[PDB]
């Protein structure tokens, strides 16, 4: 499903301010990371990144390619391809707590300035 | 005897649909003034806009048909002295949009002394003819309001889809990069290059710039480029070593159709 900025901002409300990252920054990050597509599947190198947050099966979630992957998030990668973002968010938090915002390659180059544009002015 | 600042032929909002199949023969019949190779020059006045329209391409013939169907009458209404160039990427390596656009610049200039270049994806059709396909004081971003993004700019730094740079503005940034293979990033790098040269971005408003995109599937061999985020972070340096100055390519064939010129080139493989 291809969500909208506002739909995303609302959905990930609970991650706001975590690790010092605002919703504006996330809205920016997620657009560039997966274009707000909850079913995005990309093959970064030898691994695959899943969903809206593009969580990789290299270490974070468990897929068929990486059977003995760390699966640090303790979840099947397929659960990151639905429209229930609560488990994608929880996994994002663990990544923020362990690796930090830099896991999201788009953050530094595309979301270091002009963040106000990413604000959802919807009630 | 020089064309008016604003064309008197403009109609404004247009109905853009992609359901009726197109027949280039009809399009040609409907566009008598267009000469071999997709060239046109108004007969009344003299146009100061010598425009070469470059379209990066590989296996998008159906889209090209619609593009030609809609753009030709529009470009004439805009009173431009233009030429249509479809830069076809031979082979099956990862698609390189920016390099192909560079080739179009070079190749086009051999045919005529264009002073303006409009770089356009094959699937974007403007919805208002007031959205002139020409150059301005500053680099012009044309597809500012795509349906794909709710008729709004996806992000203020966006310079993708359809944009134009005068010959001076283009040489100014050493053209575009050639090192971006696969989808994503190249357009942001180009945007970065404009900034690192005091140049800003000109744009029509969100209504005059509404644009329709022919929906399609992700083409084979155009998967997101893994290193696109690292690359856009070092544009200030790489732009000096990656551009027109370093462009190399082998033209395999030049085709002149009545509505456009298709140049098939071998642009090598990713380094
Ligand atoms: O296999 C391909 C990939 C891309 N393109 C051209 O490159 C543009 C940009 O590609 P795409 O539409 O896939 O990019 P997106 O806008 O959807 O990111 C297209 O409009 C085409 O003009 C093409 O002709 N063949
Ligand atoms: C670094 C990157 O991926 N930038 C892309 C850009 O190439 C693309 O034109 C635009 C619209 O789809 O979305 C951005 O996220
Ligand atoms: Ca989920
Ligand atoms: Mn497209």
Residue of B nearest to A118 (CA): B155
What 3-state DSSP class applies to B103?
A: helix
Q: Which two tokens stand for residue B112?
A: 């005529």
Q: Greatest CA span in chain B, whole angstroms?
A: 53
3-state helix, strand, coil in chain B (%, to 5): 25, 25, 50
Cα B151 to ligand 1 centroid, rounded to whole Å: 19
For residues B13 and B25, what is the distance between their CA atoms, to the nearest angstrom? Answer: 26
- Beta-carbon count within 10 A of B42 CB: 18
Q: Which two tokens stand for residue A63?
A: 């897929």
Of B110, B106, B45, which is closest to residue B81 (Cα–Cα)?
Answer: B45
Of A116, A94, A115, which is closest to residue A18 (Cα–Cα)?
Answer: A94
* Any ligand 2 atom below 6 A from CB of B185: yes
Residue with the two structure tokens 């993708």: B160
A84: domain CATH number? 1.10.530.10
How far away is chain B from the Cα of A106, in angstroms, using its nearest Cα?
A: 6
- Beta-carbon count within 10 A of B168 CB: 10
Inter-chain CB proximity B156 and A105 less than 8 Å: no
Residue with the two structure tokens 């390659």: A105
* Any ligand 1 atom below 6 A from CB of B123: yes
What's the distance, CA B98 to chain centroid?
10
How far away is chain B from the Cα of A109, in angstroms, using its nearest Cα?
A: 6
- The tally of domains found in chain A comes to 1
For residues B268 and B271, what is the distance between their CA atoms, to the nearest angstrom? Answer: 9
For residues B249 and B52, what is the distance between their CA atoms, to the nearest angstrom? Answer: 19
Strand A49-50 and strand A55-56: pairing? Answer: antiparallel
Residues in chain A: 123
Inter-chain CB proximity A28 and B224 less than 8 Å: no
Experimental method: X-ray
For residues A85 and A40, what is the distance between their CA atoms, to the nearest angstrom? Answer: 13
For residues A82 and A39, what is the distance between their CA atoms, to the nearest angstrom? Answer: 7
Residue in A4, A45, A109 nearest the CB of B229: A109
Inter-chain CB proximity B154 and A44 less than 8 Å: no
CA-based torsion, B29, B35, B36, B37: positive or negative: negative
CA-based torsion, B151, B156, B161, B162: positive or negative: positive
Boundaries of domain holding A110:
1-123
Residue in A31, A43, A118 nearest the CB of B223: A43
The pair phi, psi for residue B96, each rounded to 5°, is -120, 85
Architecture of domain B1-271: Alpha-Beta Complex (3.90)
Residue in A44, A109, A114 nearest the CB of B233: A109
Q: What is the resolution of this structure in A?
A: 2.3
* Binding region of A for Ca(2+): 79, 82, 87-88
**Measured between beta carbons, which residues in chain B are less than 8 angstroms from residue A108?**
229, 233
**Measured between beta carbons, which residues in chain B are less than 8 angstroms from residue A117?**
155-156
Contact B227, B184 (CB under 8 A): no
Inter-chain CB proximity A44 and B226 less than 8 Å: yes
Inter-chain CB proximity A114 and B229 less than 8 Å: no
Considering only CA atoms, give the Rg of chain A.
Answer: 14
For residues B13 and B74, what is the distance between their CA atoms, to the nearest angstrom? Answer: 11
* Any ligand 1 atom below 6 A from CB of B168: no
State the DSSP string of B125-171.
EESBTTS--S--SSPEE---EEGGGTSS-SSTT---SEEEEEHHHHH
State the DSSP string of chain A.
-B--HHHHHHHTGGGTTGGG--HHHHHHHHHHHHTTBTT-EE--TTS-EETTTTEETTTTSB-SS-TT---TT-SBGGGGSSS-THHHHHHHHHHHHHT-GGGSTTHHHHSSS--GGG-----
A98-118 core/surface letters (b: 16 or more CB in 10 A; e: else): eeebebbbbbebbbeeeeeeb
Mutate which of B121, B163, B182 for ligand 1? The one with the most ligand atoms within 8 Å of its CB, which is B121
Strand A41-42 and strand A49-50: pairing? Answer: antiparallel
Q: Greatest CA span in chain A, whole angstroms?
A: 44
The CA-atom distances, in angstroms, between A3 and each of A12, B21, B149, B234 are 12, 31, 11, 31
For residues B45 and A77, what is the distance between their CA atoms, to the nearest angstrom? Answer: 63
- Beta-carbon count within 10 A of B26 CB: 10
Q: Which two tokens stand for residue B189?
A: 């790098």
What's the distance, CA A85 to chain centroid?
9
For residues B14 and B127, what is the distance between their CA atoms, to the nearest angstrom? Answer: 5
Residue in B155, B156, B233 nearest the CB of A31: B155
Q: Which two tokens stand for residue B166?
A: 């005068």
Considering only CA atoms, give the Rg of chain B.
Answer: 17
The CA-atom distances, in angstroms, between B214 and each of A19, A106, B2, B60 are 40, 27, 36, 11
Chains A, B: CB contacts within 8 A come to 28
Of B120, B115, B86, B91, which is closest to residue B103 (Cα–Cα)?
Answer: B86
Domain ranges of chain B: 1-271
Q: Which two tokens stand for residue B225?
A: 């480029």
Contact B122, B60 (CB under 8 A): yes
Q: Which two tokens stand for residue B196?
A: 């690192």
């Amino acid at each position: 499903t291809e969500l909208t900025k506002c739909k995303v901002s609302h959905a990930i409300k609970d991650i706001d301010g975590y690790q010092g990252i605002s919703l504006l920054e996330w809205a920016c990050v997620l657009f560039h990371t997966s274009g707000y597509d909850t079913q995005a599947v990309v093959n970064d190198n030898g691994s695959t990144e899943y969903g809206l947050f593009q969580i990789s099966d290299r270490f974070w979630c468990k897929s068929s390619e990486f059977p003995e992957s760390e699966n640090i998030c303790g979840i099947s990668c397929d659960k990151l391809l639905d429209d229930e973002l609560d488990d994608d968010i929880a996994c994002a938090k663990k990544i923020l707590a362990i690796k930090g915002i830099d896991y999201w390659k788009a953050y530094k180059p595309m979301c270091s300035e002009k963040l106000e544009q990413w604000r959802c002015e919807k009630p | 005897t020089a064309c008016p600042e604003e064309s008197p032929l403009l109609v404004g909002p247009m109905l853009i649909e992609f359901n009726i199949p197109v027949d280039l023969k009809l399009v040609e019949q409907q566009n008598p003034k267009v000469k071999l190779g997709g060239r046109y020059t108004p007969m009344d006045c003299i146009s100061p806009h010598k425009v070469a329209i470059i379209i990066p391409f590989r296996n998008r013939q159906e889209h090209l048909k619609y593009w030609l169907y809609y753009l030709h009458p529009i470009l004439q209404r805009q009173q431009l002295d233009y030429g249509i160039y479809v830069i076809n990427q031979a082979g099956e390596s990862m698609f390189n949009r920016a390099k192909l656009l560079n080739v179009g610049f070079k190749e086009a200039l051999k045919d005529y002394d264009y002073n303006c270049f409009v770089f356009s994806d094959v699937d974007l059709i403007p919805m208002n003819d007031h959205n002139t396909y020409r150059c301005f004081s500053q680099p012009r971003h044309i597809s500012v309001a795509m349906d794909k993004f709710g008729f709004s700019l996806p992000y203020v730094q966006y310079f993708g889809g359809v944009s134009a740079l005068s010959k001076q503005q283009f040489l100014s940034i050493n053209g575009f990069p050639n090192n971006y293979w696969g989808a994503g990033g190249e357009d942001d790098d180009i945007y970065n290059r404009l900034a690192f040269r005091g140049m800003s971005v000109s744009r029509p408003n969100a209504v005059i710039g509404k644009t329709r995109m022919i929906r399609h599937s992700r083409d084979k061999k155009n998967e997101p480029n893994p290193q696109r985020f690292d690359r856009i972070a070092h544009t200030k340096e790489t732009m000096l070593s990656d551009g027109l100055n370093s462009l190399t390519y082998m033209v395999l064939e030049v085709q002149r159709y009545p509505l456009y010129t298709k140049i098939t080139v071998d642009i090598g493989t990713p380094s």
